[PDB]
Amino acid sequence: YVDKIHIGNYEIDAWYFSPFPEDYGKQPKLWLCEYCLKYMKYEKSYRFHLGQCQWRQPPGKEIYRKSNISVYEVDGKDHKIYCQNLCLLAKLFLDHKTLYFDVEPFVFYILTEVDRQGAHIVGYFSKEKESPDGNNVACILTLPPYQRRGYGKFLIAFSYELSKLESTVGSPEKPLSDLGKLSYRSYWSWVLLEILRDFRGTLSIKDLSQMTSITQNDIISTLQSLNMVKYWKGQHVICVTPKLVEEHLKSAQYKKPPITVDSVCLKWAPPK
Template identity: 40%
Template sequence: MEKKGKRAVKEELYGIIETRNIEYVQYGVSLRFPTWYGSTAYFQQTTRHLGLRDSDGRRSAGDGIDEKPKSSRNVPESSDFWLETLCVCEYCFKYTDDPNELKKHSSQCRFRSKSPGRIQYRTPEISIRKVSGSRHPLFCQCLCLFTKLFLDNKSMYFKVDHYDFYIVYSNQTHKPMAFFSKDLTSFQKHNLACILTLPPYQRKGLGTLLMDFSYKLSIHDDIMSGPEQPLSPFGLAGYLKYWSTSICLQFLEGSLQGKSRVSLEDISKATGMRLGDILLTLRNLNCLSEKNEISLQELRLWMKHHRQHTHAFIDDDYLILDD
């Protein structure tokens, strides 16, 4: 009974489907890779043709590269997939089922040379741009649609006006590589709603970089914060690694170095982390004594084996945050 209940709830979430219904993504003109999850949000619900409606039944602004209804013509009749290949622009995330349309669009996409949003962080190699959902709704809608193909529980696509998107760009190619979204109306003041490193750019530390950047925003705003809860098992594992590294750095090299007594509030002020997340991390590190005193020896031991993760942290010298 419980399993059926969970499935029923899942089916009520717009766009979510139990199986993959798009087989491949043609990402730009040169990259092609399989999807991880399905999404009905790209399709008209009654015909399964590419071309979508929002949750109120209205045509979305992000209805494809050429703004024409799609036929989903590139899927064999015997296939279980609704579409064999979704062609997506790697600059603006507009989409089509026609490779020729994608090629034509990619050569003249307006974001090819000038990316949206304002730069908040810039190193010689990458930039993080703040893109407002209210100012760039089409771009953000298309990004959210694309994200659903690689995140199982993504269910927000169209109502992006109260979200900011922080996107990592390559300074050399102007291509987006990873992003997180932030809900501006969050009562709990979460610093992150959704995070994804795009498939071609994974295993480069970009997820850790964005986690660290989200806490730089929290510290800048003088609040204790963290990601929306509950985290998936994969998300929790990623955050525990980040939280552990962040806390260890503060004790061994940062503002908490050399202090004889440190409270949870001290750690929170240094890291921007919520007290509950700090306590969870310290217990996970096995560095709390029976008297709840922190063992620096355990922190040093953990850091010895995880030092490589620190290369992905934000360099404060390159921050350009809004006042």
């Protein structure tokens, strides 16, 4: 059982088992390069690697840059080892995550804090290029020392900005971490309340779906938890009132994400 890793300037306690291969899985501590994510069992390997490795960012393409955060798009087929290493890293903090080596069918979006020293990984989500159910996120993770800062909700918003450009709806693929579960609920609720506040709730479920790329099922689910939807005997109807929306946007429970995605800062289109 790997009890902790050293990556960049942090030693982080592992939350869960991760199948680092062969003998690496038996080590009580592993050392990861914060840029290329290669794992090592010996401190000296790490320290030598520090001065040798010339990576100061994820591989792949920087597709987002706003202030000190950038997102890098990494295709599992172009940078297989990096992505395998990312998944093994993720699994240390992800209970329910199940593939980590068959990365070719995935694209990975790596969230980074950028300083003069480089672009530092703080989290990611993976996305199955060809989802038969149209899942727009497979797994999502903020690394522990960066949690509680809105990075999870940023990545979730980001996944929908991609879906919007693809002109489709999309939903995360079960299962999600419990923290992911709460970030989705919070992000969906805010997004829908923002719209129902500004449109005076005069739109259909389908409309909302088109405006946000949140699937109709997930919109309905969110509106139910908000007590703002009713099954008219054939279909779901939005039942919103000024009181409901105001006293929801008030309770600090529902707050704007501290970090939001600026479409103008996203330079990306789907493949073609």
